Amino acid sequence: SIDKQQIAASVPQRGFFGHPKGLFTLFFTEFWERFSYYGMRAILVYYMYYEVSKGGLGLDEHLALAIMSIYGALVYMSGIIGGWLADRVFGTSRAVFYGGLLIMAGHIALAIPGGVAALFVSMALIVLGTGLLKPNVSSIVGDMYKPGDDRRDAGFSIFYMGINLGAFLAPLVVGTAGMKYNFHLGFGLAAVGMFLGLVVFVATRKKNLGLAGTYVPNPLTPAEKKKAAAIMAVGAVVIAVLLAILIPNGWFTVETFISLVGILGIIIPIIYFVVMYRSPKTTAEERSRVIAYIPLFVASAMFWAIQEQGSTILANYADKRTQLDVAGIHLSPAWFQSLNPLFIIILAPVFAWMWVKLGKRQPTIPQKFALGLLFAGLSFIVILVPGHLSGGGLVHPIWLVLSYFIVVLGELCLSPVGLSATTKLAPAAFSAQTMSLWFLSNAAAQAINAQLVRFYTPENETAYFGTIGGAALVLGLILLAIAPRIGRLMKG
Ligand SMILES: CCCCCCCC/C=C\CCCCCCCC(=O)O
């Protein structure tokens, strides 16, 4: 490691709206990565299930939705792996660079003419690369501000804004291009996007970031390096040999893989919980907190399950169930992916001010989890209504807009205290695993989403949204009820 002072001395403190110019490097690196990721995502599902004669891959709709859910799950998991690689082998600056390259390569694999193999390579590359870039670019931003710098919070706010900004614009740019012209054009704009991110990062990182992220904070010892190398190699050959017999004669298919991820999405959280609870490095008080954290973890998973379907199930809904020809124009179904970030950008400051105004009277953290869940469930009840009231046919887009609006109301309750809840209830020995634990509730939710896709059909649409929405409402009520004790139990 290097001391934070010498690192700070190596980073310029001016140059970007009162902030260090390094914030420019990090804002735009991350903006373009998110832009590219979200643009590609706004059209990917359609690319999968649109007919071959329409530029698509001609996959079954259900398979496309399942793949999309596993995709998000794997991306969430990858960030855990990626964080460890920066911390113990690459440093963060180099993780960002390699991640970017991998991401760019992933987009190119889609931008060129290709079929379903190209899609699978593209996913792998983007899963790996986003794992390396996304958590680590954010680690570097803290590194620019010396301890005690009052600009730090604001610098993080500006940085995070770029992410939402990327999320808002991408469906309007890549979404429009991909749907109106050609899918590969869309994927190409995503590729160019990431390229601009790489360009800004490589061209400016030396002067703007100085020493930040250039060292390995927690390096493996020589013996560890040999251990890791052996485990990897053996691991690589063992995976390879299974697939050799399995892909033709196993059989190992995309269905198996989707199932596997589903299994893992349940198994992993359970192991994490057992390990934390049984750990000899924990106090009796910490053990009670781990137990207290379970309903919060479940509420989170349920919440993200609904929220993450905004990019899968509801994307299909925008495309197959929604009246797009309104006001003399034709709406692109991908454009609905701009609604979640838009509402976040607008409502976040309103909520902030609200909690301030509430002060001592504001809901506790477990109560805000509950509220998030209640709103998420409500968003699904709302969405079932028009298809239920109509005999058939496309429904007015205002309903989908309202459903996205409502889930945002829930997101601004639960999400901003998610990390805080996790840190307050995890044992001190596991303080470093705190971001992973929080990300895991999302990963698990999307892993499960992929197994729920078979239930989504025009015929049981009502049972689908109704059952999931009802589950969330029920869970939200139970959480409200047990929230008092969970709150008093919180560390602080
Ligand atoms: C689907 C993606 C898989 C292909 C990409 C993975 C390739 C792995 C190759 C070997 C990793 C070792 C190279 C790392 C460079 C280290 C640079 C440094 O430490 O300074």
472: closest CA among 265, 301, 312? 301
What would the DSSP string read from start to end of 400-462? HHHHHHHHHHHHHHHGGGHHHHHHHHS-GGGGGGHHHHHHHHHHHHHHHHHHHGGG--STTHH
**What method was applied to determine this entry?**
X-ray
**What is the whole-number distance in angstroms between the Cα of residue 259 and the centre of ligand 1?**
28
Which residue's alpha carbon is at the smallest distance from atom 16 of ligand 1?
Answer: 90
Domains delineated in the chain: 1-492 (1.20.1250.20)
Rounded Cα–Cα distance for residues 492 and 356 (Å): 18
**34: its two tokens:** 């998110």
**What is the whole-number distance in angstroms between the Cα of residue 131 and the centre of ligand 1?**
13
**What is the whole-number distance in angstroms between the Cα of residue 99 and the centre of ligand 1?**
10
**65: its two tokens:** 């939705």
What would the DSSP string read from start to end of 8-28? HHTS---EETTEETHHHHHHH
Which residue's alpha carbon is at the smallest distance from atom 7 of ligand 1?
Answer: 102
The CA-to-CA distance between both ends of the chain, in Å, stands at 30
Which residue's alpha carbon is at the smallest distance from atom 2 of ligand 1?
Answer: 125
What would the DSSP string read from start to end of 258-286? HHHHHHHHHHHHHHHHHHHHH-TTS-HHH
Q: Is 302 in the pocket of ligand 1 (CB under 6 A)?
A: no
Alpha-carbon radius of gyration of the chain: 23
The neighbour count for residue 280, using CB atoms within 10 Å, is: 5
Sign of the C-alpha dihedral computed for residues 385, 386, 387 and 392 taken in this order: positive
**Which residues are CB-neighbours of 386 under 8 A, at least 6 positions away?**
395, 396, 399
Residue of 92, 102, 110, 130 to mutate, ligand 1, most atoms within 8 A of C-beta: 102
For residue 482, give the H/E element and its range. Answer: helix 461-488
CA 150 to chain centre: 29
E strand intervals along 196-349: 325-326, 329-330
Q: Is 90 in the pocket of ligand 1 (CB under 6 A)?
A: yes
Q: Is 409 in the pocket of ligand 1 (CB under 6 A)?
A: no
**What is the whole-number distance in angstroms between the Cα of residue 222 and the centre of ligand 1?**
19
Q: Are residues 254 and 408 in contact, defined by beta-carbon separation less than 8 angstroms?
A: no
**442: its two tokens:** 């999302």
Which long-range contacts does 403-406 make (Cβ < 8 Å, 24+ apart)?
403/314, 403/379, 404/310, 404/314, 404/336, 404/339, 404/340, 404/343, 404/379, 405/339, 405/343, 406/375, 406/376, 406/378, 406/379, 406/382
Instruction: Say whether 330 sits in a helix, a strand or coil.
Output: strand
Rounded Cα–Cα distance for residues 95 and 89 (Å): 9
Angle between helices 92-111 and 116-144 (to 10 degrees): 150
Which atom of ligand 1 is nearest to 89's Cα? Answer: 19
